[model samples]
Target: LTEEQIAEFKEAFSLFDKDGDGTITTKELGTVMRSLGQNPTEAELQDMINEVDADGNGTIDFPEFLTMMARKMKDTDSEEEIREAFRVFDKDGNGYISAAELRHVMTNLGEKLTDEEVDEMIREADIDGDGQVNYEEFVQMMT
Candidate 1:
């Protein structure tokens, strides 16, 4: 990790280290995750605690938190990019990319594409065969 990254992580850690104890507990982790748009239930949050709390304690020290940060650092950027791209296609705000929207976007993108081509593209990404591409399927297509 870079110096700036560490510095930012330290700042976030300090924000959640409300007791100034130099350690973060599962409760603090839930707050951090909630800030990031994740609202996992208590059981789910504890699963994350078990995964990253390497010392077998109920709390995570700075070094342990760093390990979790590194693991997510790479994918987090790409995931945000993918979400933005998905937003463009799901303009109806329906949470799914319909074939009509896909065709319109593809046709307007550059070269004119046949309806068949657009359907094939959607089929490839629509893993559930529901005739629409959701966020998970869109990520599979992008990667």
Candidate 2:
């Protein structure tokens, strides 16, 4: 995972860990999916958690969260459709996504991000210090 991915994962984990503890206990996990805008039933949540809780501690730590995400991303087709995602950012088809274009797209998506967050996103994916994300860099960001 990239630094950006790790940061995102930590943010998500923090959301789930409402008690501010390092781990997400079973009670904390109870409404995680719902809080994140999902509607999984209790049974479904148990099944999913059981599948990821390798230690049977009934808690999800950072490593377990990463494991679950790794499996989910592996099953998703995002990698195959990465080109489409890249094209969305490279609206002008100029083969790269500029900072301004990235900012515009993110801001227009109904939820605006802080400029610092946007800048960090660009810096993380913009390898070679080009200050822009090319198709290859976009792929790097996704994977």
Candidate 3:
């Protein structure tokens, strides 16, 4: 990212730091999360905190938060990107994305899927059943 972006992220992180302790507790993270209209469950937020708590100190430090931001940003796809991302998996491009779209579906669950979550789902698909992930299999998972 550019220096300007880094500076902006740092500024936002500081807001989450609340007490200016230089790290963000999940409590503070939840506060910001609510501001953004994301109402994650306690367990889910704890899980999120654990994912980025670099030192396992039960909180997110700067580097840890940056890494989370990077990962979170890496795998996002718009409805259009979904149609496009499928192209990456489909070499022949057999009519837009429908061909590869059937390769390994992960989004359209109840909520959006994260990069790690998507990878894990693909692995799950490969192991269980017929190695085929259908549209509804993922579409219903969004919630």
The 0-to-1 C-alpha lDDT of every candidate, in the order given, reads 0.81, 0.78, 0.62
The lDDT leader among the candidates is: 1
lDDT of 3 by residue, 12-40 (tens): 88988999988888789899899999999
Ranking by lDDT: 1, 2, 3
How do all the candidates rank in terms of TM-score, highest first?
1, 3, 2
RMSD of 2: 13.1
* Per-residue accuracy of model 1 over 33-65 as CA lDDT, tens digit each: 899998899898777766666667867788767
Compose the digit string of candidate 2's lDDT tens values, residues 31-97: 7666779887777766676666766776777877887767753224344457787777787889999
Number of the top-ranking candidate, with TM-score as the measure:
1
Report the Cα lDDT for candidate 2.
0.78
lDDT of 1: 0.81
TM-score of each: 0.48, 0.44, 0.48
Give me candidate 2's TM-score against the actual structure. 0.44
Q: For each predicted model, how many residue pairs clash, with residues at least 3 apart or on different chains?
A: 0, 0, 8
Candidate 2 clash pair list? none
Between the candidate structures 2 and 3, which one is better when assessed by lDDT? 2
